[PDB]
Amino acid sequence: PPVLTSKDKITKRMIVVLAMASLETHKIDKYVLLNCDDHQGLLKKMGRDISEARPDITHQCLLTLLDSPINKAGKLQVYIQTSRGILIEVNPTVRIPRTFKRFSGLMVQLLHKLSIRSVNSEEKLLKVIKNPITDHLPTKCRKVTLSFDAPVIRVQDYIEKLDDDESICVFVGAMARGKDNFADEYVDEKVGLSNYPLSASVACSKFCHGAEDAWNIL
Amino acid sequence: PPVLTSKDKITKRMIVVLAMASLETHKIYVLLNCDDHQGLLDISEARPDITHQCLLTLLDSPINKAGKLQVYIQTSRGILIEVNPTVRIPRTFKRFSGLMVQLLHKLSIRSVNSEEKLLKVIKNPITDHLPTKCRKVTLSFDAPVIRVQDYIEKLDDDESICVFVGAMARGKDNFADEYVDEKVGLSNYPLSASVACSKFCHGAEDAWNIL
Amino acid sequence: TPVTLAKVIKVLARTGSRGGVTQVRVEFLEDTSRTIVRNVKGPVRENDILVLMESEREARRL
Amino acid sequence: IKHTLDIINVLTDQNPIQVVVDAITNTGPREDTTRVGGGGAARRQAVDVSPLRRVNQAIALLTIGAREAAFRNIKTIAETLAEELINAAKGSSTSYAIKKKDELERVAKSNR
RNA sequence: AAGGGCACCACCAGGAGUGGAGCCUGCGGCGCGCGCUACACUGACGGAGCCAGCGGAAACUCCGUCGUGACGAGGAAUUCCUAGUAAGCGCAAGUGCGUUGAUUACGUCCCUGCCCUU
C-alpha cells in the first residue's frame, strides 16, 4: 500500500486541507502551543486572538482523518494551513499522538524544526513546505470549500462525477467561527454537507464516509 | 426537535452506549487519565479522552441535531449515565473533566435554569431504559463486516437501534454480551472508537434521509 | 468549439489599464464587418492570429 | 535533442520535428487569467494570450515537464522528452503540459 | 485637486539566490553578514580525445566498467538583476583572465514612491 505524497501528481485521491489552523508556540522559559485553556487569561489581556487559539480543533480533525478507512486504504492525504500562513504536509502513516498534551509537544517541535523524522526511516512524518498548496497538489484535482452557506451536496454523488483520473481537494476551516473564504483564491466552488452547521471534525468524517462509500472502502 | 429520553419508549431512535468508559475520579478531585497519572500507575483503564472524543463526535452529528440519536455511557466500573441530546458538551478535555468530576459526585448536571438534566447517573441495567422495540448490537473488529445503510433499512418501522461501542484503547468485545442480539464489524480495518461512531451515525443518517 | 480567429488592427496608443493586460481592437477575419474590443495578456503588435472562444465580451478597464 | 527526435521517430515514424511542432501547437493556452484587483480577496479575470507567449510558454512547459517530469527514475531526458513531446503531440491526458493547459483554461471559463 | 513624466529600493512577466546543516570568517552582544563543504546514472570511476586568455587548464567529448543498493535540497521573510550578460568552469597575479553559455525584460503608469508643470 504505497504512501501518498505531494511528489506523486497522478494518483486519484482525496485531499483534506485543514485551513486556518490555530498553531502558535508560546514562550513563558519553555515552549507550548497557544491554546484557549492555558492562555484565555493572557489572550484577553492583549484583547485579541479571541478563539484564534483552538489548536484542539486541528488535533481533533487529524485523529478523525487518519483514523479513517480512506486513510487506512491509502487514498487520502492531509495538509495543514495555519492562521499565520504555515503549510504542513502530513505523512499518511503517521500515528499522531492521541492526547492534546502530547500533540502540543510534537507540534511545537515540528514548528521549530520544520520537520518530524522517523527514528529509523528518512522519510518525514510531518513537513513544513512552501506555499502555495497548489504547487504540491495533483495535476488534475477538483478543489472545493466546505461552507454552511453553500449549496448542500450528497458527497457520494459529488464524487462519482469525478474523472477517473481526477482527484478531490477539500478545504475545511479548522476553527470555531469565521468567513469561509480562507481559500476563495484556489477553489472551483463551495459546498455545504448538511442543513445543520457542522464542526470541522464532523465535516471531515462526513466527507471521508462519503468517499469511502463511493470508492468502495470498508 | 422534541428531546429524546429514556421515558419515551416508543419513538424510533438510534442509541449509542459508550461502554467501558474510563471515568474514574482521582482524589488530590479530577479525572484519572494517562497524561497526568501515567506515572502514578495500567494506562488502559484510564482513557477518558476516548469518551470525550466520542461525545463530541456523537453530539455534533446531523442525526443528533435531527434528534433521532441518544447517547448513554457505561463505565468500566458499571456506572450508568444518560446524556441529554441537547447538551453542548465542553469542547476541551480540561473543561470536560471539571464537569465530568462534578457529575460523578452529584449524580446529575442540571441546567442553570431549565428543569431538564443535561447529564444524569441512572440505575442499571441499560435494558430498563431502552425502547421496547430495540435491536441490541455490539461493534467488534472480530465480526462480520456490514454496510450500516443496508442494516438500518431492515429495521421494523418501529424498531430502534442500539449499538454498544467500547470507549477503550484495547480489549475484549464481551462488555455487552449479556444484552446483545448480535456482534458486527463496520470495517476491514480496526477503527478508533470515535471513528466507529461516525461510521454508524453517517450510515444511519443516509438510511434515514438526514439531511 | 466554434473557435474564431481574428487579426489585430489597432493596439491602443493611450489607455487605462492594470499592467500586463492591454486592450486591442480586432477585426474578425471571417467577415470584415465585426470589430471587437478585447484584452490580451502577452506582448502584441499588429497583424496576427487571435484565438477566440467567447465572442462578444465587450470588456472594459481592468 | 538529436536522440529525442530519433526516439520519437521510432515510436511513430512521422517527422519527430512535426511531432515537436504539434506538441508546441496543441499546448499553448487560449485564455490565461490575470490577477484583477478584487477588493482584497482577489478575483482572477478571464485575458487572452499572445501567440509569442503561446510558443514561449509551451516550450517552457514541455521542457520543465521532461526535466522535472522524469526525476528520480530509470530514464534519460532524451526519453522523458520524447514521452512529453509524443503525449502532447496527440493529446491524451498523459502529458503534464496538456493537463496543465486544460486546467489553466478550465479556470478561465470560470472567470467569465 | 489636474496634466505630464521617471523608477524592478514600483508594477507588469522570469532567473539566480539569501533566510535551513556543520565549519571558516567579520559584526553585535556578553542575534546578523560574506563564505567553504555537503545531502549521484544530465553520474562516478578507467582508457582515450584534446582546446584558452590575462600573466597540451578544468568543465567538456568519445569508448568502456559500475547498475540504484548535523545535513535526505531548506519557515515566515527577503536581495540582485536585461548579452558573450547570468550561471557554470578553471587559470595567472597579490584583483584580473579567458572557456561553455542561457531563460526573461526592453513594457506601462494599475499600486508605492519621486520629479515637472498647472
Swiss-Prot record, chain B:
One of the Pfam families matching this protein, by short name: EMG1
Main location: nucleus
One record GO biological process: endonucleolytic cleavage in 5'-ETS of tricistronic rRNA transcript (SSU-rRNA, 5.8S rRNA, LSU-rRNA)
Binding residue positions for S-adenosyl-L-methionine: L139, G166, G171, K172, D173, L186, S187, N188, Y189, P190, L191
GO CC entries: 90S preribosome; cytoplasm; nuclear microtubule; nuclear periphery; nucleolus; nucleoplasm; nucleus; small-subunit processome
Reported effect, D173R: Almost complete loss of SAM binding. No effect on growth and ribosome biogenesis
Enzyme Commission (EC) number: 2.1.1.260
First and last residue of the signal peptide: none
Site positions per UniProt: Interaction with substrate rRNA: R47, R88, R91, R95
Mutagenesis or variant effect for R95A: Loss of substrate rRNA binding
Enzyme class: transferase
Consequence of gene loss (knockout): Depletion of EMG1 affects growth and leads to strong ribosome biogenesis defects, with defects in 20S pre-rRNA and mature 18S rRNA species.
Keywords: Methyltransferase, Nucleus, Ribonucleoprotein, Ribosome biogenesis, RNA-binding, rRNA processing, rRNA-binding, S-adenosyl-L-methionine, Transferase
Effect of A196D: Almost complete loss of SAM binding. No effect on growth and ribosome biogenesis
GO MF annotation list: identical protein binding; rRNA (pseudouridine) methyltransferase activity; rRNA binding
Catalytic activity from the UniProt record: pseudouridine(1191) in yeast 18S rRNA + S-adenosyl-L-methionine = N(1)-methylpseudouridine(1191) in yeast 18S rRNA + S-adenosyl-L-homocysteine + H(+)
CDD domains per record: Nep1-like
Residues carrying the site annotation Stabilizes Arg-88: D49
Annotated localization: Nucleus, Nucleolus
Gene3D superfamilies assigned to the protein according to its UniProt record, in alphabetical order: 3.40.1280.10
Quaternary assembly: Homodimer. Interacts with snoRNA U3. Interacts with NOP14 and MPP10. Component of the ribosomal small subunit (SSU) processome composed of at least 40 protein subunits and snoRNA U3.
Protein family membership: Belongs to the class IV-like SAM-binding methyltransferase superfamily. RNA methyltransferase NEP1 family.
Record's protein name: Ribosomal RNA small subunit methyltransferase NEP1
UniProtKB/Swiss-Prot annotation, chain C:
Example GO molecular function: structural constituent of ribosome
Entries under CDD domains matching the protein: S1_S28E (cd04457)
UniProt keyword list: Acetylation, Cytoplasm, Ribonucleoprotein, Ribosomal protein
One GO cellular component, as annotated: cytosolic small ribosomal subunit
Transmembrane segments: none
PTM entry text: N-terminally acetylated by acetyltransferase NatB.
Subcellular location: Cytoplasm
Classification via InterPro entries: NA-bd_OB-fold (IPR012340), Ribosomal_eS28 (IPR000289), Ribosomal_eS28_CS (IPR028626)
Residues forming coiled coils: none
Gene Ontology BP terms: maturation of SSU-rRNA; positive regulation of nuclear-transcribed mRNA catabolic process, deadenylation-dependent decay; ribosomal small subunit assembly; ribosomal subunit export from nucleus; translation
Gene3D superfamilies in the record: Nucleic acid-binding proteins
Predominant place of localization: cytoplasm
Function: Component of the ribosome, a large ribonucleoprotein complex responsible for the synthesis of proteins in the cell. The small ribosomal subunit (SSU) binds messenger RNAs (mRNAs) and translates the encoded message by selecting cognate aminoacyl-transfer RNA (tRNA) molecules. The large subunit (LSU) contains the ribosomal catalytic site termed the peptidyl transferase center (PTC), which catalyzes the formation of peptide bonds, thereby polymerizing the amino acids delivered by tRNAs into a polypeptide chain.
Other notes: Present with 94500 molecules/cell in log phase SD medium.
Sequence similarity: Belongs to the eukaryotic ribosomal protein eS28 family.
UniProt cross-references to PANTHER family, sorted A to Z: 40S RIBOSOMAL PROTEIN S28, SMALL RIBOSOMAL SUBUNIT PROTEIN ES28
Assembly, per entry: Component of the small ribosomal subunit (SSU). Mature yeast ribosomes consist of a small (40S) and a large (60S) subunit. The 40S small subunit contains 1 molecule of ribosomal RNA (18S rRNA) and 33 different proteins (encoded by 57 genes). The large 60S subunit contains 3 rRNA molecules (25S, 5.8S and 5S rRNA) and 46 different proteins (encoded by 81 genes).
Protein's recorded name: Small ribosomal subunit protein eS28A
Gene of this entry: RPS28A
Swiss-Prot record, chain D:
Subunit record text: Component of the small ribosomal subunit (SSU). Mature yeast ribosomes consist of a small (40S) and a large (60S) subunit. The 40S small subunit contains 1 molecule of ribosomal RNA (18S rRNA) and 33 different proteins (encoded by 57 genes). The large 60S subunit contains 3 rRNA molecules (25S, 5.8S and 5S rRNA) and 46 different proteins (encoded by 81 genes).
Localization terms from the record: Cytoplasm
Residues included from the entire protein: 114 to 225 of 225
Function in brief: Component of the ribosome, a large ribonucleoprotein complex responsible for the synthesis of proteins in the cell. The small ribosomal subunit (SSU) binds messenger RNAs (mRNAs) and translates the encoded message by selecting cognate aminoacyl-transfer RNA (tRNA) molecules. The large subunit (LSU) contains the ribosomal catalytic site termed the peptidyl transferase center (PTC), which catalyzes the formation of peptide bonds, thereby polymerizing the amino acids delivered by tRNAs into a polypeptide chain.
Post-translational modifications reported in the UniProt record: N-terminally acetylated by acetyltransferase NatA.
Protein's organism: Saccharomyces cerevisiae (strain ATCC 204508 / S288c) (Baker's yeast)
Protein name per the record: Small ribosomal subunit protein uS7
Covalent link Glycyl lysine isopeptide (Lys-Gly) (interchain with G-Cter in ubiquitin), residues: K90
Family to which the UniProt record says this protein belongs: Belongs to the universal ribosomal protein uS7 family.
